[PDB]
Symmetry: C6
Subunit: 313 residues, 6 copies
Amino acid sequence: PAYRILKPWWDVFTDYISIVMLMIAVFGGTLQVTQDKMICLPCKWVTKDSCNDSTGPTGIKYDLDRHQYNYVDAVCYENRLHWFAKYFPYLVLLHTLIFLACSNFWFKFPRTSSKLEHFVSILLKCFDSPWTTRALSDKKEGEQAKALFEKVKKFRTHVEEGDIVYRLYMRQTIIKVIKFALIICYTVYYVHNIKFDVDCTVDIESLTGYRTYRCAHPLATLFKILASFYISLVIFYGLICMYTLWWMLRRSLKKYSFESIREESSYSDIPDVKNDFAFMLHLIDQYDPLYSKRFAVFLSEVSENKLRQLNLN
Amino acid sequence: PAYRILKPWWDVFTDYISIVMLMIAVFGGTLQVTQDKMICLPCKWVTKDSCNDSTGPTGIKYDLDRHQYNYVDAVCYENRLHWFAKYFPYLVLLHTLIFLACSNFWFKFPRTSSKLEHFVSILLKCFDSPWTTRALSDKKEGEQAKALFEKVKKFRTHVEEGDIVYRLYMRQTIIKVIKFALIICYTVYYVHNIKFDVDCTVDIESLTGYRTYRCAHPLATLFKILASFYISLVIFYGLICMYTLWWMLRRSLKKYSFESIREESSYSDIPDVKNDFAFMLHLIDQYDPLYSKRFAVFLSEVSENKLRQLNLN
Amino acid sequence: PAYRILKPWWDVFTDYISIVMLMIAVFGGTLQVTQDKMICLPCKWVTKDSCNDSTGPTGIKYDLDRHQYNYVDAVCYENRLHWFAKYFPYLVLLHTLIFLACSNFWFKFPRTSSKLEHFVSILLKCFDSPWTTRALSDKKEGEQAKALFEKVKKFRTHVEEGDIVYRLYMRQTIIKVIKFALIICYTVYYVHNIKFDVDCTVDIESLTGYRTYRCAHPLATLFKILASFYISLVIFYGLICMYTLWWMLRRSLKKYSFESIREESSYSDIPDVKNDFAFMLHLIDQYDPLYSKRFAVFLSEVSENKLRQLNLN
Amino acid sequence: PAYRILKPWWDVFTDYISIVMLMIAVFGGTLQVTQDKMICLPCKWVTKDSCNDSTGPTGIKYDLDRHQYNYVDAVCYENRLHWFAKYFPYLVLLHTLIFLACSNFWFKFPRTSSKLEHFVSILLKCFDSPWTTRALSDKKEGEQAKALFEKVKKFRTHVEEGDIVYRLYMRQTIIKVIKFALIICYTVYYVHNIKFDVDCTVDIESLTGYRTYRCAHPLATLFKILASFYISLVIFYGLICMYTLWWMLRRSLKKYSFESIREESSYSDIPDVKNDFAFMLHLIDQYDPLYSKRFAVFLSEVSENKLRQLNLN
Amino acid sequence: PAYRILKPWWDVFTDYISIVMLMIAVFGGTLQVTQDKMICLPCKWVTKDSCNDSTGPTGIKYDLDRHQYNYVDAVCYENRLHWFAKYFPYLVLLHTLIFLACSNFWFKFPRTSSKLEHFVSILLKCFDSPWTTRALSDKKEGEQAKALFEKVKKFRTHVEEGDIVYRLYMRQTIIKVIKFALIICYTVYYVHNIKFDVDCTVDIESLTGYRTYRCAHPLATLFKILASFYISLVIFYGLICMYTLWWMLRRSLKKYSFESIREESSYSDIPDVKNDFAFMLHLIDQYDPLYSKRFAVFLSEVSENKLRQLNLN
Amino acid sequence: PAYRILKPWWDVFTDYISIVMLMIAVFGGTLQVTQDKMICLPCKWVTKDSCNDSTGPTGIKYDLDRHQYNYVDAVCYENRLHWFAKYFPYLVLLHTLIFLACSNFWFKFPRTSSKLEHFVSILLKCFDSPWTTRALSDKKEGEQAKALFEKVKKFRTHVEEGDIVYRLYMRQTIIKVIKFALIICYTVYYVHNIKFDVDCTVDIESLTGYRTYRCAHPLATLFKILASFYISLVIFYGLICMYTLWWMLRRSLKKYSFESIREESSYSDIPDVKNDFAFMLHLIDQYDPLYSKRFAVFLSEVSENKLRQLNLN
Ligand SMILES: CCCC[C@@]1(C2CCCC2)Cc2cc(OCCCCCCC(=O)O)c(Cl)c(Cl)c2C1=O
């Protein structure tokens, strides 16, 4: 609704990566639903579960109808084919949905959603107050300005003691980094099991007659292309999340200093925000510094004295 | 619209879970419409209604053309296949639309829809009132505030007589819990009955010539995957519903305790709500306490007296 | 628009049942147009136009190619398969469309649509006027109050002589009831006729060589399930329609005795409504009584006297 | 826009019949594009270019491979199948598009579209004035009423010169009637021609060996059902068009005798509208007469007299 | 949004024709990508690379398997089918997109889009200004009308030097006429080259054994139908384009002879617009002359003198 | 939003070329997913692993059933076909997506984004002001204008010291030119490796019997058509990008030469903009010069002085 301003730049690359993951997931899924077949032929000469590889040339007769071929194709497709070759689109679709849910649960949780909406509402009211220009460069605007002043005071009293949003943003990025590490741990290890050629040895003699078969999975090359693209793209995602975790654990976003604003505004009476509002204003500062610049005048008591003097006279 | 206030955190997890149940339901349904076939071959040697399992190898002939393979496939699909393997996506689709209808019958019933929409209008009027900023710490505003006071007084007089919302939410959550209990009661009993290869015996010798057949159901592994995922999802849904039922049966939702804000807001004359209105105030408090903070000053005769003094002056 | 307040609860359950019906209708239609198959085999030994049921086992050779099988499938699909087994989704789609048209013809007809929209506009205007709170408990507001009194008197003179809305809303329900009766009286009679096993005898010897054929319709069980579900759902629809028709012939909706609100408010000089206005006022009372209760003031001559007195002083 | 005022009730039934016509057209079209096959077999014993119909039973061997069957199906489909069976959905698609274009050409033509939009703007402003209440039963309202009076006078002097709206409505309804005559002229004549059993004699002996063939067309019954449904829809559409053409040819909508409303409103100074505005006022009367009731007071010389004396005092 | 008033009547028929060209193009394209095959048979007796047409009837045996038939189908589809039968839908799709680009480049170009936006904004203020009625038949209204007077005066010298809009609207229509010319030269000369019977002699004897084949393209009739429909639609489009070209070369659109308003309105002093603004005046005159009628009072020095005297008094 | 003000004519042609690139990419992609088959036949007589090309004729018998035909089709399609014939739609889709991301990174990056909406906000507010006409031709307008002088002075003091927008808009165009160089370098080099006829000698003798095969790729002509169309589209894209890069490198884009307008606007005290704001002023002047025309009056010292004496007197 009104959360568009509260997203830093690392949550835009995250959004586009997470939507292209979903589109390649549904592409692989509709491919595997569409065909994902296997073509298998029996080997006449066998030497310990291996095809022995033994006027004009003529064809080789196997004495099999089409439906025995279908049966052995299904059986060799299930039993002697790796599980990663079959359900990889479903795995990446599930992981994409878990990434999306982990990204948007912070917004959709009502306990922090209320605080976010309240903060962005008073931020828009602070930005739209015309008295900032007179404070930084008569009466009725005095009453709307004092309405802003005491409701900003009420908000500062209301949200200072909390510790919830910073903890949520800790846990979200922590589980995102851990899940990225697990995905890279298993995917590159199991990606080599997809291959065009596969040999099944099922021991179903009473239905066909032969024992070992030579199969051919035709979608293996395209699935390897999709898997390699997915791995490289989730490396990019993991580096982005690692950088934002390092930034948020390095800048010590619990508390906010406010020296660089008072040094230019020459308002010597300004306090420092303690926690859970300092981090939120750090986030809007990483959006831009000007929105935090115009939030300065609604906290100085000398600005309050100037406002009440202009109201009285 | 503005009904997001009226939903706690346990009623958006329910919605998201219902969406993902509906997606897996429609995916299983379109798969079952798309193929859901099976491949059946006759066993040449039969022992106790089971297949006996008995220079170069050559294929086994059956002297059966393709169309009577199609016939025996259809017959052994319709007769000797367990019905849970066939209609599981339709079953879970039916269950998720029952869950959606139960979760939205609270809002779509007009006798409660009117009460909630008028309550939302009253609360947005109370929240948007500028006089609460003065109250928690000038004639037309006072008259508008007095109109607000009289309208919330008659609204309180109106909705205190009912008891419909609390009992509907009771009879909604309890049937959601019993639906969860029955779903888990039967689907884990029947989930073991889907499998890849199945032996069918349908007694058609006048048409094919053989008696018993060995079949293969190629979608069994993926349907078992989807069924296990659905069972785990139903478990998490049921734990959420049992938690909210325990909360509503423990907290004694009918009455309101309001002294906890009376003692700090210094308005020693506030009443205790009887039923069907204190429950909704508890629900808004479960969203956030601040909307209940701003509703404190609108029900106190000292506050109407202060407004009367201000209107006199 | 805002016509949701103009539909009772027995026209919302109808609106959901009659879209579930369309959903199962389009599902059955796409299934029937997608598969549309039945598999047929010839019986070599025949008795009374039924199949006689007569080293290792070997297949039975009919010496037919695939295209003869296709031809006999088409012939036994049309000539010896019952029409209810084929066009049932189109029948239920037609019934659902006629039900929806009968439900919304009342709204879409302009001669009553004008009365309904101008009615709901004056009720919304009477709801939103601020003088109602003062009257149930400063001259410009009296001017709009006098204008609204005049237009309410104009409405009362305008709509008191008609009967078209009541006549249409009774005729729609009675033809819905008779439609429900027709649907149940043929569908449960013809629902037993679909089955998996069908025998066809079509007299084509000059083309294939055989006389009678044993067939198989694989969609029979799913179509029977859909038909039974449709019958139960139409039964629920008909019960709702019977209830509302009994309500209309019970409560005698032509006139409205308006005693309770006048006794509660002590405005003893109020008249009763003749017809075609009491109907919509009964409907909005079935929505909620407060819209009618706050409509009481704009008809009372003592309320007119108080309005002109407040205009005078 | 808000053109629902400018549509009589017979243009809504038309606008829904044209939708269901489009629906059956697109359904028949997609079914025909999907299958529309026909299965052909050769007759071994032929007399006078017709199939003569001359221990256990055995099949009849033609010694033909599948791809020749496909060739003879294509040939007997393209030559000896009547064109009404093949192109009926495309014909009805073209027809319903011509109905939609003929319905909306009266709106999309700009020379009349400007008059309709400016007319409906004037009627909404005249309907939304509070001065007509006083006219039927303080200075700036008189001034804006005078401005609206001048606009009404300018509109009356402007549109009194034309005839184009009535001319176009003639030219639309008469060609709708002619198109009805043409459709019912040929379609009921040709509808018997589609049928299931179809014979062909295409003179291909050098490629197959046989001369005549017997064929089957498995969609013929469904196409006959769809054609009958389309015929009934055309009949209903044409009855509606005949009724509205007859009504508008007998009412003589060029001029309006305005006597019957001011004989009871007691505003005797009213003229009769000559052309192109009386027809539009009859159209909005067929919507409802109250809109022209509230437009009647804004044209009376005694009404400007009362307005300007109220401006004087 | 409100760009519709700039479009003449011939630019709307052009738009709807371009829509129906697009839908027939996409229908032909989806049909061609769906099937577009042909069925080919070899003929045993050959004369001049054609087939010579030289106890019961028996079929002809060719000893070709299905995959050889598929190969010869592919070869005779690619090498001996005319290119117009294959790429006609994509060709007409390209032509439709070119026509749409030629009709919307006049809007999407910024140097003319800004001028059109300024023209439509100034004409809507001139339509909504209330001083026009008083001129053709209070101090702040006259002052803002003076502001609009000077804005119109500066716009007049802002647009009196250009020619870009007229140049672009000339060039677009003349290249559309050129494109119609090219379309009519090639498509009627090439439309005769599709038919049901096509011969191929492709010289693949080492793989099959036969030399010449006779094929059957089963979509030639429907493609001929679509091509004839497209040809007639193109002819109608071109007649519209020739009409607007003749209108542009005949009516001398560069300057406007504006007197037809001034002898009617007795405003004896008015100038003649020279170029690039009189063209826009013609363009809005083709919509309706009312907008040019109301623009006269915002361009006459006697009208600024009257407003100046009125603001003085 | 209204951000079309920022895109010149070369930035709209680029977007339309990109979207038609995307539709031809997805068309080729869905076609390749849908069929992309290849039909292969063995060659009986072999010379250097190539086909030797050697009463009525009869077919050549290969003694191959359909399933090993499918196997050899898959093997020859995977091993002995160039990868550009198979992954061209995926490649061009990737290039289209990276072009779109490169084009929209200038908007989606927040550090420059915020500067863009702040700049466009002050530009629309300057265009919306009514005092520019008075400047280039009562007192609260003077106060509003003074406030907007303070706002534009704040904008000028803030955004002037940056360079990031100019740096990013250079870096985007340079990599678009680099991508053009790469695409034209490799695509036309590899475009000739798609062909109708392909020979595969894949050494599968113990499964089929033959050694060399002749194949036919039925999509090669359509893929070559699409490739040529894509190359021409890339060429147009690259000429547009090279032109705008040359304009950017040549026209000394960093600083504005504003003195050409102060002689006619008679405000000689206007300075030249240093950097990163003159880029935006060029980028709006490319749209239209009026927005820069009426931007002189809001920054000139004599303009604030004339407003000062207008407020004083
Ligand atoms: C085993 C002896 C058969 C003899 C036969 C003759 C043809 C020239 C030599 C003998 C007839 C026939 C029909 C077929 O269609 C069957 C339809 C299956 C396609 C479904 C999916 C798709 O559409 O792909 C197929 Cl596939 C073949 Cl192979 C053959 C032949 O070989």
